[PDB]
Amino acid sequence: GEIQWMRPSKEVGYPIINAPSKTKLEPSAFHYVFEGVKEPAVLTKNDPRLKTDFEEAIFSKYVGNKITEVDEYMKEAVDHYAGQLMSLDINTEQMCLEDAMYGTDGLEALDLSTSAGYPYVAMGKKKRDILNKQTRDTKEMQKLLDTYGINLPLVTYVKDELRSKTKVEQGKSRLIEASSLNDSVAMRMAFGNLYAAFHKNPGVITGSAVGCDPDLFWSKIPVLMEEKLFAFDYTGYDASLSPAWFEALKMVLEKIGFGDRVDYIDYLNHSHHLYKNKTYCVKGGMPSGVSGTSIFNSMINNLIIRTLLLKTYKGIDLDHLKMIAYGDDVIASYPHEVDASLLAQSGKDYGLTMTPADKSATFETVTWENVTFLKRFFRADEKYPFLIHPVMPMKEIHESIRWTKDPRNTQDHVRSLCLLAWHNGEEEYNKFLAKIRSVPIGRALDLPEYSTLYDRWLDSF
Numbered sequence: 001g002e003i004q005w006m007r008p009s010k011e012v013g014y015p016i017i018n019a020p021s022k023t024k025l026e027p028s029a030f031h032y033v034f035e036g037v038k039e040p041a042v043l044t045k046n047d048p049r050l051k052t053d054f055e056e057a058i059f060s061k062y063v064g065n066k067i068t069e070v071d072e073y074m075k076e077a078v079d080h081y082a083g084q085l086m087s088l089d090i091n092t093e094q095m096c097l098e099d100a101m102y103g104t105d106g107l108e109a110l111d112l113s114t115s116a117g118y119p120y121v122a123m124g125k126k127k128r129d130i131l132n133k134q135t136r137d138t139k140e141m142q143k144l145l146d147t148y149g150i151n152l153p154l155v156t157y158v159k160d161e162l163r164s165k166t167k168v169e170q171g172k173s174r175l176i177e178a179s180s181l182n183d184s185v186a187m188r189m190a191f192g193n194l195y196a197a198f199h200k201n202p203g204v205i206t207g208s209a210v211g212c213d214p215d216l217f218w219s220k221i222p223v224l225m226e227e228k229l230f231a232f233d234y235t236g237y238d239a240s241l242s243p244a245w246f247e248a249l250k251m252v253l254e255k256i257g258f259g260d261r262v263d264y265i266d267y268l269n270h271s272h273h274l275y276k277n278k279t280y281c282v283k284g285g286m287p288s289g290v291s292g293t294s295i296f297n298s299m300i301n302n303l304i305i306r307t308l309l310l311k312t313y314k315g316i317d318l319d320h321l322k323m324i325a326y327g328d329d330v331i332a333s334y335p336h337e338v339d340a341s342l343l344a345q346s347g348k349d350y351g352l353t354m355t356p357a358d359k360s361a362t363f364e365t366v367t368w369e370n371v372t373f374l375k376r377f378f379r380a381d382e383k384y385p386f387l388i389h390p391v392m393p394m395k396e397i398h399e400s401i402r403w404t405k406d407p408r409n410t411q412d413h414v415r416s417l418c419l420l421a422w423h424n425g426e427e428e429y430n431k432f433l434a435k436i437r438s439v440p441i442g443r444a445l446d447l448p449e450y451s452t453l454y455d456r457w458l459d460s461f
């Protein structure tokens, strides 16, 4: 991805977009009960903690574009992945406006709390004033579609979240690209059935894990991965995607029956953005935040890995490449050992910056003991080995509980953490509950005991 130009929004006919400048994050009742080092990300150029230009840091993710066209290996990757998706019999029909708006089997309704994007965000008009979940009314929406059309600018927001000290000082805050409600609705109508098919089919056929339930899905994964596992991390995956990857994606879509609406992918690839009082144009780069983002990033990941394997290991048998992606995150396997370091090398030529799985310093062999997916390890249950525990380390959880974005959601926030933490074992879980209950706020929460979560887990399969 590469920013073509950037300039005052007024010069191109756009209003200044006002965005929050103060974080909603504040020390929670457990701030000093648990250890942590993360703080709220910088949200403005005038933040006292900044040790470098803010605007420069937040846009540096656009490292540029390394490839213009779709080469021989990419076409091969496209044919193989498309043929594989072909076996799911995905309904290629367009999804009606009502379902695209309020949901249907395999697709949740539109999130009524997130931004409505441009121009609504500039007219002070919110989603709540456009759709009614009880009515499933599509009259206002329709009227808005006809009035403002599609292919509207995306609104760039800084993500209000916890970041490390380094990332705070280096102004490395992440950005959200809120697309207009019109495009979101248009895209969910165009790809609604594709999204549904993926959500209902997490695994090695879609090569996607979006819409999955770790508690249940973890037990299915091992029986889907071949003998040798391999994985690696990406640096600025979304922003690094070159236009060629979007073209490769459209080819996949064409081959599976959606060639009818590949133009919507151009909207993602060559995108128009609004940030504060500036407007900019980007060539390449996936708009992190847009509807379908997760799925399209996952699809492109399936193309990338296949491409690097073809380029690096001619004669590789893609039919035995078993991988599951969730955006840039991936867990892959092959009957034979492969060199991630070599693949990483090939990756550079495709505009991808690949590094050792889980911040390792060197490319080490990935095993079932050290592999992670969505920050979770895999651990067989001591009593019933066929049941696999998704284990997220307590560090992440400790960092999160020390802050709050709304005192009214303390119960939900802490319960959420509990559903992640109990998998670390009973000894650990109880220590966690005890600390929570060492302060008044914690003692007033209704939290599930270990044996309760274990029983609930077994009863969920």
Ligand code: NA
Pocket (backbone or CB within 6 Å): 001, 268, 269, 270, 271, 282, 283, 284, 285, 286, 287
């Ligand atoms: Na883009």
